[PDB]
Write a protein that binds this ligand. Structure first.
Ligand code: AIC
Ligand code: AIC
Ligand code: AIC
Lengths: 37, 1018, 197, 100, 50
């Protein structure tokens, strides 16, 4: 059915709120790298 | 061929279009199927002996038939039932994968080679033989709208037009029916008979006499008299029709020239053949059609529904057709997901690209690099023996993500250069594919060492792992080429460089940093390795612990808008009783489950493990998914609670349950040392009872012994009176069990003519006297003049395993984990039993190697075909372990995932990690690759090389994940339509793809570096 | 009604079976039969036996098994009347004519008789030989006869059921090569724009 | 010695009706000569196992023939495949006018 | 032209290839004794040989 307007939207919204959520989890596991000390 | 196919676009394009068009056809040529033939096909010889009993039948039919099959090929295990009614069902199973056709045709003969021995009654009724498949593809039932239909007329009507109407569709099945095609019934009556000095015999005789088509040559045929000009055949007595004629039959004529009609001795009417199965639809008089099968399984179904109009008008009083059980929607509502998925995924991918390549003028590449493949994939599916089904569908869906992957993994690096070397569209795209080249191959050929290996598996399980395996291998195929001959091509045509806004296109900056932080990071972490390596193992440990802490399921308990519920009454329960207790059942659903329970096909006298007029089953059709919100409004619970409600329903056991979500524990005892049923039933006693003292919070499947009525015809006294020990036996069973006399055409159709004494005279023991036999003397005689009674126990149903007296058990230990122990008790537990009593495994139990009990066998294998395949990269040994090692990471991810989610290690899951591991392997490669390259391709630079790589390769890795990890969020949530499977899958990879990127990257530069420092140490 | 109607649109359609033939009904009168004491069996056998031929035993004829048939020689079975001729025996031990308990009467019947799919049916041979477009020749029938009673349905047998013939489908695969050829030829370096020639 | 009536109902019927489950039954034709003759021809989709396509049937015939009239069983029920009709039809004749 | 021409050409399965063989049928009225069917066959047989 013509729900592309409520789905394509879920996309723009989904992507961002999910990518950084990936990037973030990759910045902390990046800093906790303090194991160099 | 890339550097080659890149200067010639059209030949490329064109070779892709071909593959496309490989679907325009592939789609079609394909049989949509609910499920992959997942069972051992199996011949099943049905027999009957009207009015016998568990004794005779067991010994006079099952025996003359089980014993006369000395030589057959692939006899896996010969099951057996023997209903007290005449019914006999030797089912013969065969190793999953035989010539169902010859596997059965190879039998029948050995049946003929023995049937001449069967009792006349048994031959005559007709011995039967079939194959058993997915039970009832969809069960249509008929009902009267205008309250004008009998419990039998709908079966009858169904019997003349519909039943045989089955095949109006494009394709049809083996078995179907309920009810009873009409049958001329001559209910009798002892008093009148004795009056007219008549025997049931006379009747049965008077029938075969005055009613039976006769052959009568013709005038002026064969060697004529020369000169005859007229030629016409003669017509003598014919079959009977009018329910009246029969009544008008002639039984005898006394001294006053007066006659006695069959009428005068029995009520004659148009009835059914047997009155043992009454069926109801929302408690409305109704009969159905057991369409046990029917090609595009999906299309057939929809056509019986098309054929439907051919009978709407037909017959004045309602007759509205309803479809209580239909295993069809699960296809439209599956094909969809695939699409929706592909659609949502193809779109979902498009977007990512923009936030990364920001070029629309090159976001299209993938949008071609995906369908094209999933198309050709459809193709290579009909290539082999695979059907567009739910199983092979996920792969499509699953593989989709992966399928996508390659795309960018091919468009980024081919563009990475676009900025790095600032080189020209075409000139760059070559060099681009000048590296991921081999990588791409091995990478791909490597996974084939993790999906394919799994294909080749057991018997039933593998029947899916492969329906899986190749479904993804297939898709992993089109993968490289389409990504090697079309992508490189579709990329070299459209695109434009530079060796270097704000708005939301600042993003890139935010990204750059994280690139840098990664580069700045890994490098430092590298320096001091061990610190991170010891952490690796802790995880390794954890994963394991975690793993062994997760359960094992075959396949979910997938919710299907269908569910059965059973009814077993006490030995002796009249039809009435079984019905009284069925009616309650039917109530509850229509009563207290209103919001969902659409209907309730109920059938009095028919249970899957028990039969006669004690059993009963109800086909509950819940309202579709979108109309049952919450969990509690779903099957699992609707079933959970109902059975709970039933409990307090004293003096009969009842319960319901969801359907297996795929068509399919059982323990067999044997009477081997020659003992008997009684002793054998005496042992299954000690066992089922003992086994009962190790449980938390085991059962026989047969029925238990029923009271029976012994007669003992006293020969002497019998002969002293002058009565044929025949006229007796016939005059008995005849009137109490029913004889199949002649046949008669009823409105253009042949039917039976049964004779049995009307109920009134056969409800009670005493009633036996009632019956009078005739002696030569010419004077009637009571049975009682030479018969005596006495009660003893017997066995409703009776069974034997492999021509041997046996009893089945249903021992279930559902912890979920290690059932290979649950069996051990039994085999030894019962080892304390008498002599002759042996054991063995039937059904699901005999299929030793299941999924998970063997999974550990093929896995350690890929640890060969993958290590092996990956070593083929120039110089592998010493290095291989790094990619290998990357595996546990994504693994402890998928694990934690299914763990938290309270999920079990299901097949789709057993599938999952593989995908993941594929990916866990995937990315790693693309890193150790450039890593390897740099160090040799040009100047040496270990640590300084790997980082450099760990960088170049990050954007892609991250890229893909955003996609895949987005083209899976869909499935993990959903529990509305199917989805349970879509739960284990989806959740399977997210948990994987996550812990497979954040955690998996840092270690590769570690694993690889340390695996390299492992060389100069010798 | 149909074969006859279809007959009013032709230029210059037929049932394949045979048509109904005259037959001879017998009707053995049981009562009268029993009053005389003659087994309704000895009868039926003594009839068909002598008029249709029974397959009795077998016998080896010069090293080969063969049949042993019994049937009354022609002389006594050419005409209706001849039925009386035949005498059956009653328990009493005294012969009895058929005629003592048999009656005749003629009715029509059907030489050959047929049914399609276990269902009573009759075949037709509707031929429209212009040569071109027979997919129309069928349409009349299906609707033409649609004006018929109830129970009377239709369907296609033999050559007719084999819907797609050569030429009725030829146009399907042809337009195809307009793909696999255009397609194949495009593979020549740079095809598009040129292929059409 | 039967006729179009009996045969139609006492043989064709006991046999056409006792074939509830068969694979690839394209269309079941039928004739029933007034002489006893009965010819259920069973067609199958161009391309099947002529061998099993037929062996797959016979059983369902046995699963019903015990009902046929004694005369009919006895004469022997038959079953075949139909191919290019008569590859070449030889006939025999008497030269010396001595043959019946 | 081609087109017009094309659509102007008939459609046959395969020729009516000539084969040195040919059948001819004989159907008499309901009741026709063997004799009769033969009398009318004999004529048929004649014509050809005749
Ligand atoms: C779907 C199939 C092609 S694979 C499956 C099974 N074949 C094997 O198990 C295989 N030989 C094997 C592998 C490992 C150890 C021992 C044996 C078999 O049989 N089935 C086929 C079929 O039924 O068509
Ligand atoms: C209708 C089809 C989908 S199945 C049929 C046949 N496929 C097979 O025999 C089977 N997969 C096979 C067995 C052994 C080796 C290789 C392949 C084939 O080709 N046809 C397809 C088609 O022409 O489209
Ligand atoms: C000689 C054959 C190899 S091709 C012929 C036919 N196969 C097809 O029509 C084919 N699947 C098809 C093509 C286009 C549309 C739909 C279906 C079939 O079956 N026959 C084979 C056989 O009998 O051996």
């Amino acid at each position: 059915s013509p729900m592309s307007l409520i789905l394509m939207l879920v996309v723009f919204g989904l992507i961002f709120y999910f990518m950084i959520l990936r990037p973030q989890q990759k910045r902390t596991k990046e800093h906790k790298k303090l194991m160099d000390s | 061929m890339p550097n080659f196919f890149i200067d010639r676009p059209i030949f490329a394009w064109v070779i892709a279009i071909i593959i496309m068009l490989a679907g325009g056809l592939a789609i079609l040529k394909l049989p949509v199927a609910q499920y992959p033939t997942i069972a051992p096909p199996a011949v099943t010889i049905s027999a009957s002996y009207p009015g016998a009993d568990a004794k005779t039948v067991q010994d006079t039919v099952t025996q003359v038939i089980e014993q006369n099959m000395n030589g057959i090929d692939n006899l896996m295990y010969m099951s057996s039932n023997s209903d007290s009614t005449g019914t006999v069902q030797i089912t013969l199973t065969f190793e999953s994968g035989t010539d169902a056709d010859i596997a059965q045709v190879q039998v029948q003969n050995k049946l003929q080679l023995a049937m001449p021995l069967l009792p006349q009654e048994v031959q005559q009724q007709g011995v039967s033989v079939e194959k058993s498949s997915s039970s009832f593809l969809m069960v249509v039932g008929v009902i009267n709208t205008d309250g004008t239909m009998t419990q039998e007329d709908i079966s009858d009507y169904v019997a003349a037009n519909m039943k045989d109407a089955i095949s109006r569709t494009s394709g049809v099945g083996d078995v179907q029916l309920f009810g009873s095609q009409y049958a001329m019934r001559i209910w009798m009556n002892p008093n009148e008979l004795n009056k007219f000095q008549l025997t049931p015999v006379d009747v049965i005789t008077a029938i075969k006499a005055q009613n039976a088509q006769v052959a009568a040559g013709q005038l002026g045929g064969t060697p004529p008299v020369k000169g005859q000009q007229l030629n016409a055949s003669i017509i003598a007595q014919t079959r009977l029709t009018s329910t009246e004629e029969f009544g008008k039959i002639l039984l005898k004529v006394n001294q006053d020239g007066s006659r006695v009609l069959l009428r005068d001795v029995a009520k004659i009417e148009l009835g059914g053949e047997n009155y043992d199965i009454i069926a109801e639809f929302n408690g409305q008089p109704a009969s159905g059609l057991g369409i046990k099968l029917a090609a595009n399984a999906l299309d057939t179904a929809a056509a019986i529904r098309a054929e439907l109009a051919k009978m709407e008008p037909f017959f004045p009083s309602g007759l509205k057709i309803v479809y209580p059980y239909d295993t069809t929607p699960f296809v439209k509502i599956s094909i969809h997901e695939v699409v929706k998925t592909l659609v949502e995924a193809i779109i979902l991918v498009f977007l990512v690209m923009y936030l990364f390549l920001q070029n629309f003028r090159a976001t299209l590449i993938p949008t071609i690099a995906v369908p094209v493949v999933l198309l050709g994939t459809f193709a290579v599916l009909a290539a082999f023996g695979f059907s567009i089904n739910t199983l092979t569908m996920f792969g499509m869906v699953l593989a989709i993500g992966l399928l996508v992957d390659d795309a960018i993994v091919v468009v980024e690096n081919v563009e990475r250069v676009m900025a790095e070397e600032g080189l020209p569209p075409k000139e760059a795209t070559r060099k681009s594919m000048g590296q991921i080249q081999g990588a791409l191959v091995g990478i791909a050929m490597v996974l084939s060492a993790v999906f394919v290996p799994m294909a080749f598996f057991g018997g039933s399980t593998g029947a899916i792992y492969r329906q899986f395996s190749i479904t993804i291998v297939s898709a992993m195929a089109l993968s490289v080429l389409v990504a090697l001959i079309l992508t490189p091509a579709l990329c070299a045509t459209m695109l434009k460089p530079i060796a270097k806004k704000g708005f939301f296109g600042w993003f890139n900056r935010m990204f750059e940093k994280s690139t840098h932080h990664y580069t700045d990071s890994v490098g430092g972490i590298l320096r001091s390795t061990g610190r991170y390596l010891v952490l690796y193992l802790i995880i390794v440990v954890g994963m394991a612990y975690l793993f062994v802490r997760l359960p094992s399921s075959f396949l979910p308990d997938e919710d299907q808008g269908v569910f059965m519920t059973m009814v077993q009454l006490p030995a002796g329960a009249t039809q009435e009783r079984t019905q009284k207790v069925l009616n309650e059942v039917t109530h509850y659903y229509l009563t207290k489950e209103k919001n969902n329970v659409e209907s309730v096909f109920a059938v009095n006298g028919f249970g899957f493990a028990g039969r006669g007029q004690n059993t009963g089953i109800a086909f509950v059709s819940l309202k579709d998914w979108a109309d049952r919100p919450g969990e509690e409004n779903k099957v699992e619970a609707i079933t959970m609670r109902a059975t709970r409600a039933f409990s307090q329903i004293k003096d009969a056991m009842v319960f319901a349950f969801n359907l297996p979500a795929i068509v399919e524990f059982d323990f067999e005892l044997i009477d081997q040392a020659g003992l008997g049923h009684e002793k054998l039933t005496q042992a299954r006693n000690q066992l089922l009872a003992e086994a009962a003292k190790h449980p938390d919070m085991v059962r026989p499947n047969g029925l238990e012994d029923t009271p029976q009525f012994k007669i003992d015809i006293d020969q002497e006294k019998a002969q002293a009176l002058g009565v044929s020990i025949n006229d007796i036996n016939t005059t008995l069973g005849a009137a109490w069990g029913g004889s199949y006399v002649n046949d008669f055409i009823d409105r253009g159709r042949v039917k039976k003519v049964y004779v049995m004494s009307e109920a009134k005279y056969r409800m009670l023991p005493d009633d036996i006297g009632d019956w009078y036999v005739r002696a030569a003397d010419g004077q009637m005689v009571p049975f009682s003049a030479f018969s005596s009674s006495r009660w003893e126990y017997g066995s409703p149903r009776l069974e034997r395993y492999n021509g041997l007296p046996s009893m089945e058990i249903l021992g279930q230990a559902a912890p979920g984990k290690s059932t290979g122990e649950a069996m051990e008790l039994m085999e030894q537990l019962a080892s304390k039993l008498p002599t002759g009593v042996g054991y063995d495994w039937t059904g699901m139990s005999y299929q030793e190697r299941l999924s998970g009990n063997q999974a550990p066998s093929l896995y350690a294998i890929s640890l060969i075909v993958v290590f092996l395949c990956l070593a083929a990269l120039y110089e592998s040994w010493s290095i291989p372990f790094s990619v290998m090692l990357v595996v546990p990471l994504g693994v402890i991810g998928a694990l934690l995932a299914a763990t938290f989610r309270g999920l079990t290690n299901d097949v789709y899951f057993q599938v999952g990690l593989l995908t993941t591991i594929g990916l866990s392997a995937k990315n790693a490669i693309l890193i150790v690759e450039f890593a390897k390259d740099l160090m040799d391709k040009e100047g040496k630079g270990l640590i300084e090389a790997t980082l450099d790589a760990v960088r170049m390769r990050l954007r892609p890795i991250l890229m893909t994940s955003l996609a895949f990890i987005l083209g899976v969020m869909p499935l993990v949530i959903s529990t509305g339509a199917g989805s349970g499977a879509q739960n284990a899958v989806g959740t399977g990879v997210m948990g994987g793809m996550v812990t497979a990127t954040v955690l998996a990257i840092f270690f590769v530069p570690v694993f690889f570096v340390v695996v390299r420092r492992r060389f100069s140490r010798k």
